[PDB]
Amino acid sequence: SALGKLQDVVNQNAQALNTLVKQLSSNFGAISSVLNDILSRLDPPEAEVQIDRLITGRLQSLQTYVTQQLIRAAEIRASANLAATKMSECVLGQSKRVDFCGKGYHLMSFPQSAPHGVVFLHVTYVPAQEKNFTTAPAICHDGKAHFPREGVFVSNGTHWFVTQRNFYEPQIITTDNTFVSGNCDVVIGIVNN
Amino acid sequence: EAEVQIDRLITGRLQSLQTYVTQQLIRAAEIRASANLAATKMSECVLGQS
Amino acid sequence: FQTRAGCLIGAEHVNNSYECDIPIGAGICASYQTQSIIAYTMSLGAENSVAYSNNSIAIPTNFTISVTTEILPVSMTKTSVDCTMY
Amino acid sequence: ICGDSTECSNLLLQYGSFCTQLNRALTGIAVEQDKNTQEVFAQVKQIYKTPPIKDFGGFNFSQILPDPSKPSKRSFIEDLLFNKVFNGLTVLPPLLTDEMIAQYTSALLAGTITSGWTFGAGAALQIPFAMQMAYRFNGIGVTQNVLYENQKLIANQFNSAIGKIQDSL
Amino acid sequence: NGLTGTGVLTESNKKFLPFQQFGRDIADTTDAVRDPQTLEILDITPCSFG
Ligand SMILES: *[C@@H]1O[C@H](CO)[C@@H](O[C@@H]2O[C@H](CO)[C@@H](O)[C@H](O)[C@H]2NC(C)=O)[C@H](O)[C@H]1NC(C)=O
Ligand SMILES: *[C@@H]1O[C@H](CO)[C@@H](O[C@@H]2O[C@H](CO)[C@@H](O)[C@H](O)[C@H]2NC(C)=O)[C@H](O)[C@H]1NC(C)=O
Ligand SMILES: *[C@@H]1O[C@H](CO)[C@@H](O[C@@H]2O[C@H](CO)[C@@H](O)[C@H](O)[C@H]2NC(C)=O)[C@H](O)[C@H]1NC(C)=O
Ligand SMILES: *[C@@H]1O[C@H](CO)[C@@H](O[C@@H]2O[C@H](CO)[C@@H](O)[C@H](O)[C@H]2NC(C)=O)[C@H](O)[C@H]1NC(C)=O
Ligand SMILES: *[C@@H]1O[C@H](CO)[C@@H](O[C@@H]2O[C@H](CO)[C@@H](O)[C@H](O)[C@H]2NC(C)=O)[C@H](O)[C@H]1NC(C)=O
Ligand SMILES: *[C@@H]1O[C@H](CO)[C@@H](O[C@@H]2O[C@H](CO)[C@@H](O)[C@H](O)[C@H]2NC(C)=O)[C@H](O)[C@H]1NC(C)=O
């Protein structure tokens, strides 16, 4: 209190109907553009030759209009199929397809009706205020390599924590958030802790 | 006498130009769908893991 | 001013790069600044080096909730023409 | 239709507005060709650059990263691709040059080598490349130790398979 | 000689065959000519438009 993608369809269709209406005032090489003024001041044998040029021109006008409507309806159908797919995948579910339902991690969507269309309101999560840390692939302890179950090992400069990858929430490294696999002599970048 | 002969050329050349313009609309509608698929692959395979 | 799109008269060629406003072509755009009409090479965006190293990581400490709109045409006007009466 | 002759041009006026429609159609399809390119390639806000010292865990991206001594600052493989493929008629140039599009793809490629998938959702957050590779292995259901214990083999296979695209093209 | 058109004539770097009187390209437009007194061939270029 924007909608140009909907105003474009309205404008293109009115602009085609106006051209179709206005081609009804060309002679196409006849004496008059109005059929009654050929019928009133001519007799059938010579009215016919003038009427045929008007028929030829107006038929071609009409055919051009119908072909360009058929090409434009096929573009509107692709749009409506995409909007049906967004209604199923963004309003009736949560999507993982990147950029399909807005920019960021999709949370939910709400539909709204428009004059010949639909407006989706996409709610997304956008991470903010990032900080720097030191990382390591694995920890070495007792000659064993430890990997995080779900997260990353981070250091604040002096201490090592595990955190989830999208929100900073540091916790102690225990045998409940890690698992073991192998020795600490094969992986490139193990640190001791 | 040249009007009747010029009109025969005008009609033919108009027909040929309009055939050219129809087939370009039909070929552009196909390039458009390919570019729409390329834009989805750039989002879903390059900026994500599908 | 001579572009690759043709010859352009009535616009000053500045040296800075803005976002594209009116597309001229072959990389040139025009805009009404300050009061006059100027023509420039468009800019793609601001530059950014990422502090990449082999033991550094960036982790976010907050978030925002974003809501954005998306508009789609579904339908058009149903029209008929009687071919004979036309 | 007429070729600069007033006799034909006056007869043509009797056909109405067919030739304003044809031009409208061709203009409408010449604008959407630039709209087509804008939506494939302008998928970044920033132009990201890659670091000068490039140690990505054994992975080698040198045949797909931009080359300054080349034409238009293209990558080595973008060159093999650009080498393999009057009377009222004109051809209009595209709005984005080829230099601009190669700039866009190098920004996408430096964003992904360096931040993973984070730059397509917000601000780019750097992560070491092998830890990103381990996240991607998690995404297909393999554990992370399988990447970290096979790092050199996985990197050699990747380098040797990028080397074959270049031959086949 | 009967070759009729309009445009701008420049001097060229072609070499006809002694019996050849004018040249044309793909799409069959005349793009060269020989003039019947100097025996020199001239390039033909359409006059700028846009
Ligand atoms: C993480 O650390 C890096 C490197 O220390 C920071 O990168 C800085 O980026 C600015 C760009 O404005 C450069 O001018 C500095 O030279 C860089 N190094 C510094 C400041 O030491 C980066 O900003 C840090 N990231 C965060 C989120 O704080
Ligand atoms: C890294 O984090 C650790 C733990 O959060 C910090 O160590 C604690 O710091 C507080 C500061 O008030 C002390 O009271 C505690 O005794 C410290 N040890 C603990 C909790 O075991 C450490 O200071 C942080 N390092 C940096 C560089 O910020
Ligand atoms: C990550 O990169 C750093 C710096 O580029 C590496 O540190 C170098 O390590 C080698 C051998 O370990 C030393 O000879 C160099 O002197 C180090 N450089 C500096 C500036 O101290 C590190 O080894 C790399 N690998 C990791 C951290 O796994
Ligand atoms: C981490 O600690 C281990 C010991 O737990 C260190 O391993 C020793 O390394 C030295 C030099 O390579 C050897 O001479 C010793 O025989 C090793 N001892 C054991 C028990 O393995 C390792 O060097 C430490 N690394 C770091 C980076 O602190
Ligand atoms: C990445 O791979 C390329 C191969 O495409 C390496 O560059 C070439 O290596 C050969 C062998 O030494 C040299 O003869 C060429 O002069 C190199 N440069 C070219 C072909 O431009 C490159 O060294 C590899 N990167 C690393 C870090 O090993
Ligand atoms: C056409 O006739 C003229 C003379 O009427 C010729 O002109 C001569 O050309 C030679 C070059 O071969 C010159 O050396 C003479 O000075 C010219 N004389 C004059 C009076 O112009 C011309 O060569 C003839 N060309 C043809 C093809 O017949």
Ligand SMILES: *[C@@H]1O[C@H](CO)[C@@H](O)[C@H](O)[C@H]1NC(C)=O
């Ligand atoms: C634009 O910058 C170039 C720098 O190479 C300079 O030569 C040119 O004179 C500048 N033009 C204007 C109008 O400032």
